[PDB]
Design a protein around this ligand. Structure first.
Ligand SMILES: [Mg+2]
Ligand SMILES: [Zn+2]
Ligand SMILES: [Zn+2]
Ligand SMILES: [Zn+2]
Lengths: 49, 240, 115, 67, 52, 49, 258, 96, 46, 49, 329, 34, 48
RNA sequence: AAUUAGCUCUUGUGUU
């Protein structure tokens, strides 16, 4: 073990990868959510390029 | 360090001495109202009910102040504090014993702001002397500052999200100073360029140009309807 | 937050009078009727009826502020005809007209409903 | 989110015509013909159905917080 | 005071049928915060009836 | 017309934007190369005689 | 110095709208009649809602607002109910209100369309407009969602809230041919003829009449379904007359004291 | 316009007749690319539409090139406001 | 005495005494929602 | 920020199809914060071997 | 509607409309932005006229009856968070209803609104200066309970209880509040024509067409010429065509198949004036207006800058500690 | 064959295909994946 | 007050119809644009 | 009657 790296949503290593609309709706996740952000301490953070 | 504490902006000299935060202030959105005289501002009920003006009890005005103290702080045209002459103050939000509600001559009553009170009305990018003018208060239902449009030019106001500040003078001397120096009608002509700063703007100007054309004719009904709106009318219908 | 209740537009409270008369002092035979909790619905019809009367020199009305619910009607009549008389006659004429229109509408509907 | 009960402008009841409108659209009617077949003359009412998105159908896809 | 914090209902007047909570009250009137509107009003206790 | 026809029936058989790139019809141009290129805003308007 | 004699002529009357023409009256009276149509015609609508259990996807105030807008058939009760401000009773009695109860529970998998037929009135003469085409949709429910509530409907007119507005559309119009020049067309040939235009296809507007007044006002009053349109018109006339008579009484009591 | 309430002759001319030449720093649109303003033109083109002249009016709509050029012309106003406010504030404070 | 919550996943109400770990008897879930109040709520349909 | 420079804030000719020519903050940071065009892509990087 | 599953998220400062509408006239680009699935704004019957003088300078006149029928009505959620934690050996916060005889520092705040858990319950009406979470820390105990923000006056939408990473109790409470479009609220078209509501008139007072069509929003003409938003006028014109014909209009930026002339020719086929003008009748007097008024459906939005979130006043409030001057904010 | 004046439909079919293949936040997801 | 009350009768508006030319002015504008384009083309030719 | 720093975002001044 080294440490924990946060994962931006809908990445290839995110749990919401390849899941269908029904799959996300069963998870209380909006299928229209673009992903593309991190969740740090329960807050949604985004990196400005 | 100590130098940083008073160096420049936000330091002691510029952030606490040349300019400070003040009591008896209000800040809301402004909206138009063409039914107000140019020296009036309409304030909502809650803002008036929250700010107080201290008034000295005298035999001339002891009955009215007694009634105001009776109304308490709940109903709007009431008072908030009653100050004895020995500095002691009584709060009217705690429904104290009626013996305390009794007031004599040398007392002060902090009554809610009512119609006719003098306030300084300001817009924050204060450039010239016409950005801090004095108005008379009028209480109005909804929750926005309302002001006649002729004065939107000195303030450079816009009615599209603009906010303006209201300061309530707290003493008779200060109120008299505002009334005698900085009332709106006294600032019509500016010393900057010896020309008016308030004029006729927008659709009032458009309609006055369309209204004084040669071929504009009015029948008696519409003439009477218009004459209903002259405050200075002498009641004599002109010969057609 | 500062929203007035809706019924404020048409409900009077304690100490509030429906109509008040004041004698205008600028000219003789003129009066100001200050009606509370009314709007253009009554002002316009009363003004028009007063304008029909040939003994009324002036008849106008106004609403001082759209957020305060009252109107002022100014009526100036010729001498030997008090403006109060003109006002009450105008009201009676409106009542007569409305009753006549109501009965004629009833008759016309009855005719239409049976071919 | 759901069909308004009344047209915002005139007040005509338009809240009972959403299902009929969808059915007429599915029955191979142009949107204009579907709207005028439901007795919506003034365009104020027409915009109420023509320019409405039914969002509650998606909202129903989530499981209830309580059961 | 007994009335403070009691769920009350207005029994008379243009506000008939509304429920609310008494925040501050006196021997003559009371202040009722309304459940349905975001406003607190003043009403005489004689039009007020305790609920529950 | 072949590309537009195959792409109109997309999301049914297999065919997508990536295959459109693969046939060498569209191309990724960056701003540095964009100096040496010469664009036509619209085909019919700016390529006829 | 006296009133004129208007005349009425209906050109169409259905269960939804009435088209008629009023003649020989002032514009002020006609416009006041229109505004009374829209504003001051007493009608019954839901105005008190208590929710015992809600688990739908809409918050409670959303549901209350949707309920308030539902039209209720109130043709003869409005004349018999009293205003809640006027009834000398504690809590709504049947003489000043009507009670509705709703209780819907969706157990089966298919979604439930909670509609206007789910409202159960305690008075047979005041029901939503489903007496005898789909229903006013209120909510959609999933499995395991329920909605239980009880409401009171009372009398009011449109000057308070638009839920008490009886009319759906009032099409007031006078002088279809611009003979009075009350509006000035920069180019009359670009303007379509009115529905009531007694003018040939050649010309665009009637010649100017220097001595003329607005006459022959055309109304097309379309009801929302609560009151029948002729009942709307009659109630409006009665209400206008009542307002004027009450004003006269108050003026008499003021004049006798001055 | 003639009432003086709002607008001016240039506003009417731009709405009806033509928007006109765009300018940045008092000059025509500079050659951001090598010897051309946009890739759609040929190198060393000093013609009107190449260097930032809008020949359409606001009613007819702007073609894409002149739309971009008009955006360039409009950006300088916001930039100038953002710098001028802070530049004049210190002037006025020192005068006071 | 005990307070009633509702679980996030299993949606089964459980009585949980004060000063107890926030957990569900089944599904060991960690998100609990409080239940609706019992006092009457009155909305005007305005 | 708080810089007297005005060249970086301006709309360069090279931002055609790359950066939106209209979306920018109006505050103290006008022209320094921008947004991508609709079809803009950003290269992720690859080895040149 | 910022996200479909907004009823699950415990965000701070969530706004959501009641009846968001798909735009009547749309650009082909927004199909891929999912704007038709999560729209933000309503098509409203906008008339460009100087009616009374309450819309003169970038102000608008709103139809009161429309607002009563749910026009632009919205709802505002606000979420609070609070967890009990072990401050130290002698200091330990805990959720519990304060008692009038065990806590030394106690104001006149009412604690009976929240139940014996120390938490408010869903459906309970709350207002400013009302405690929501009953939290006390031992000294015998001092108050540390949270309060609703001053001048909010909402209804508790939902309450959630869980554990943080280190296993302490932790509650998040979402409070909702319905906002009605009162005067002072801010509205904007899609072409930068922002303004605040000046006054609201009922359907009876607003001007009307030959039929009973009355504007929802009346804007001043003077907003147009100096700003030259001709796109606003063209969108208004094609809104009528889209509404009558029964199909969503196209406003793709560079089309050349759509111009004002063709739109006018289409409009004149539905019995209207080809330039979109109509004859309006004065609302108060019923008289015609000598100038035909431009009117049509246009898309408007409700910006989040509501007046009730900005109104502020002070008279001898709290004070700072360093320099005894009135606080900030 | 060439596509004359039936081009707006083709012009938007290709764009729709592009936006189906790659979303609107493709750069961020691709960068983090890499 | 007086002018704002008379505007209730007179009215005021602005629309698409206030931005249209009489289709003879459009010809003049197009001709002037073509003349200017020819002029600048000629000047560039002389510089060439 | 319970705190200060820092950072970010946003509003009005962008009239001509
Ligand atoms: Mg402004
Ligand atoms: Zn409608
Ligand atoms: Zn009763
Ligand atoms: Zn569980």
């Amino acid at each position: 073990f080294i440490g924990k790296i946060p994962i931006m949503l809908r990445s290839t290593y995110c749990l919401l990868n390849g899941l269908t609309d029904r799959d996300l709706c069963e998870l209380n996740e909006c299928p229209l959510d673009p992903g593309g952000y991190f969740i740090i301490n329960g807050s949604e953070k985004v990196l400005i390029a | 360090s100590l130098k940083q504490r008073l160096k420049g902006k936000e330091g002691r000299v510029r952030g606490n001495l040349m300019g400070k935060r003040v009591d008896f202030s209000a800040r809301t959105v402004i909206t138009p109202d063409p039914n107000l005289s140019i020296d009036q501002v309409g304030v909502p009920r809650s803002i008036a009910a929250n700010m107080t003006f201290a008034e000295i009890v005298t035999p001339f005005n002891i009955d009215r102040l007694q009634e105001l103290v009776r109304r308490g702080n709940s109903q709007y045209p009431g008072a908030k504090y009653i100050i004895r002459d020995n500095g002691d103050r009584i709060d009217l939000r705690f429904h104290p014993k009626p013996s305390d509600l009794h007031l004599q001559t040398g007392y002060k009553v902090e009554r809610h702001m009512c119609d006719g009170d003098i306030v300084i009305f300001n817009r924050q990018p204060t450039l010239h002397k016409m950005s801090m003018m004095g108005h008379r208060v009028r209480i109005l239902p909804w929750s926005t500052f309302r002001l006649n449009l002729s004065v939107t030019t000195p303030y450079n106001a816009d009615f599209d999200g603009d906010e303006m500040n209201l300061h309530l003078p707290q003493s008779l001397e200060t109120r008299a100073e505002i009334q005698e120096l900085a009332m709106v009608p006294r600032m019509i002509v500016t010393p900057q360029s010896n020309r008016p700063v308030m004029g006729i703007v927008q659709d009032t100007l458009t309609a006055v140009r369309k209204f004084t054309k040669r071929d504009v004719f009015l029948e008696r009904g519409e003439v009477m309807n218009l004459l209903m709106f002259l405050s200075t009318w002498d009641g004599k219908v002109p010969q057609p | 937050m500062n929203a007035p209740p809706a019924f404020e537009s048409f409900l009077l409270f304690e100490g509030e009078k429906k109509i008040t008369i004041n004698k205008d002092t600028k000219v003789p035979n003129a009066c100001l009727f200050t009606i509370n909790k009314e709007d253009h619905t009554l002002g316009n019809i009363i003004k028009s009826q007063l304008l029909k009367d040939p003994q009324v020199l002036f008849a106008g009305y106004k609403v001082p502020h759209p957020l305060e619910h009252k109107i002022i009607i100014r009526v100036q009549t010729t001498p030997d005809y008090s403006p109060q008389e003109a006002f009450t006659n105008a009201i009676t004429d409106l009542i007569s007209e409305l009753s006549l229109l109501e009965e004629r509408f009833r008759v016309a509907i009855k005719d239409k409903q049976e071919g | 989110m759901i069909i308004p009960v009344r047209c915002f402008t005139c007040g005509k009841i338009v809240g009972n015509k959403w299902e009929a409108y969808l059915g007429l659209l599915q029955a191979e009617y142009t949107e204009g013909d579907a709207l005028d077949a439901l007795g919506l003359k003034r365009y104020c009412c027409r915009r109420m159905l023509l320019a409405h998105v039914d969002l509650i159908e998606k909202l129903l896809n989530y499981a209830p917080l309580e059961k | 005071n007994e009335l403070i914090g009691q769920t009350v209902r207005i029994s008379q007047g243009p506000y008939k049928g509304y429920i609310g909570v008494v925040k501050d009250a006196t021997e003559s009137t009371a202040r009722v915060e309304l459940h349905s509107t975001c406003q607190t009003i003043s009403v005489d206790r004689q039009r007020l009836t305790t609920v529950g | 017309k072949r590309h537009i026809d195959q792409l109109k029936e997309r999301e049914y058989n297999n065919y997508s934007w990536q295959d459109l790139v693969a046939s060498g019809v569209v191309e990724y141009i960056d701003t540095l190369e964009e100096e040496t290129v010469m664009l036509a805003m619209t085909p019919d308007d700016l390529q006829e005689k | 110095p006296y009133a004129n004699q208007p005349t009425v002529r209906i050109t169409e009357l259905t269960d939804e709208n009435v088209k008629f023409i009023i003649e020989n009256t002032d514009l002020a009276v006609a416009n006041s009649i229109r505004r009374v149509f829209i504003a001051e015609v007493p009608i019954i609508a839901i105005d008190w809602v208590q929710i015992d259990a809600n688990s739908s996807v809409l918050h409670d105030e959303f549901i209350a607002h949707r309920l308030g807008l539902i039209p209720l058939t109130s043709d003869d009760i409005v004349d018999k109910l009293q205003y809640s401000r006027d009834c000398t009773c504690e809590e709504f009695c049947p003489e000043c209100s009507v009670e509705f109860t709703l209780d819907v529970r969706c157990n089966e998998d298919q979604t439930r369309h909670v509609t206007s037929r789910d409202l159960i009135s305690n008075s047979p003469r005041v029901i939503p407009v489903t007496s005898r085409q789909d229903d006013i949709l209120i909510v959609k429910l999933r499995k395991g969602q329920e909605l239980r509530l009880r409401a009171y409907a009372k009398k009011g007119f449109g000057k308070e809230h638009a839920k008490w507005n009886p009319t759906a559309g009032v099409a007031f119009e006078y002088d279809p041919d611009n003979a009075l020049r009350h509006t000035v067309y920069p180019k009359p040939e670009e303007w379509p003829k009115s529905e009531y235009s007694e003018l040939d296809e050649d010309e665009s507007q009637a010649p100017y009449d220097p001595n003329g007044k607005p006459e022959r006002f055309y109304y097309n009053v379309e009801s929302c379904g609560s009151l029948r349109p002729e009942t709307i018109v009659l109630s409006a006339l009665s209400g206008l007359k009542k307002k004027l008579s009450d004003l006269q009484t108050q003026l008499s009591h003021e004049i006798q004291s001055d | 316009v003639v009432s003086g309430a709002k607008g001016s002759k240039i506003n009417i001319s731009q709405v009806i007749a033509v928007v006109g030449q765009q300018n940045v720093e008092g000059k025509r649109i500079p050659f951001g690319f090598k010897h051309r303003t946009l890739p759609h033109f040929i190198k060393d083109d000093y013609g009107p539409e190449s260097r930032g002249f809008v020949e359409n009016s606001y009613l007819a709509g702007l073609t894409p090139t002149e739309f971009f050029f008009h955006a360039m012309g409009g950006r300088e106003g916001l930039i100038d406001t953002a710098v001028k406010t802070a530049e004049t504030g210190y002037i006025q404070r020192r005068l006071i | 005495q005990p307070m009633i919550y509702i679980c996030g996943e299993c949606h089964t109400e459980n009585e949980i005494k004060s000063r107890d770990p926030i957990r569900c008897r089944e599904c060991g879930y960690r998100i609990m929602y409080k239940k609706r109040t019992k006092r009457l709520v009155v909305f005007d349909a305005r | 920020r708080d810089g007297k420079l005005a060249k970086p804030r301006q709309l360069h000719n090279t931002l055609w199809g790359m950066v939106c020519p209209a979306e920018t903050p109006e505050g103290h940071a006008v022209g320094l914060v921008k947004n991508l065009a609709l079809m803009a892509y950003i290269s992720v990087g690859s080895q040149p071997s | 509607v910022y996200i479909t599953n907004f009823h699950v998220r415990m965000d701070t400062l969530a706004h959501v409309l009641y009846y968001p509408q798909k735009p009547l006239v749309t650009t082909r680009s927004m199909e891929y932005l999912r704007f038709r699935e999560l729209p933000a704004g309503i098509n409203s019957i906008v008339a460009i006229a100087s009616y009374t003088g309450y819309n003169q300078e970038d102000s608008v006149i709103m139809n009161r009856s429309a607002v009563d029928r749910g026009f632009f009505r919205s709802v505002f959620y606000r979420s609070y968070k609070e967890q009990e934690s072990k401050k130290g050996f002698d200091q330990e916060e805990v959720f519990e209803k304060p008692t009038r005889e065990t806590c030394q520092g106690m104001r006149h705040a009412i604690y009976d609104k929240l139940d014996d858990d120390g938490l408010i319950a869903p459906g309970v009406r709350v207002s400013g200066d009302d405690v929501i979470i009953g939290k006390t820390v031992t000294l015998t105990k001092r108050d540390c309970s949270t309060f609703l923000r001053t001048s909010e006056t909402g209804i508790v939408d939902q309450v959630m209880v869980t554990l943080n990473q280190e296993g302490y109790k932790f509650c998040k409470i979402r409070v909702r509040s319905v906002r009605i479009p009162q005067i002072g609220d801010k509205f904007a078209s899609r072409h930068g024509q922002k303004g605040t509501c000046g006054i609201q008139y009922r359907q009876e007072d607003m001007p009307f067409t030959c039929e009973g069509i009355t504007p929802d929003i009346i804007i001043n003409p003077h907003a147009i010429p100096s700003r030259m938003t001709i796109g606003h006028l063209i969108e208004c014109l094609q809104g009528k065509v889209s509404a009558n014909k029964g199909e969503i209009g196209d406003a793709t930026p560079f089309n050349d198949a759509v111009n004002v002339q063709k739109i006018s020719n289409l409009l004149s086929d539905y019995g209207y004036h080809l330039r979109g003008n109509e004859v309006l009748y004065n609302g108060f007097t019923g008289r015609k207006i000598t100038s035909q008024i431009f009117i049509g459906p246009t898309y408007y939005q409700r910006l989040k800058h509501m007046v009730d979130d900005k109104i502020h006043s002070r008279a001898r409030g709290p004070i700072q500690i360093l320099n005894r001057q009135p606080m900030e904010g | 064959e060439i596509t004359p004046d039936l081009w707006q439909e083709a012009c938007w079919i290709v764009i729709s295909s592009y936006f189906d293949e790659k979303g609107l936040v493709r750069q961020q997801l691709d960068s983090f994946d890499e | 007050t007086v002018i704002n009350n008379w505007l209730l009768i007179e009215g005021h508006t602005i629309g698409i119809g206030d931005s249209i030319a009489d289709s003879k002015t459009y010809q003049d504008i197009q001709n002037t644009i073509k003349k200017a384009k020819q002029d600048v083309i000629e000047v560039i030719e002389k510089a060439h």
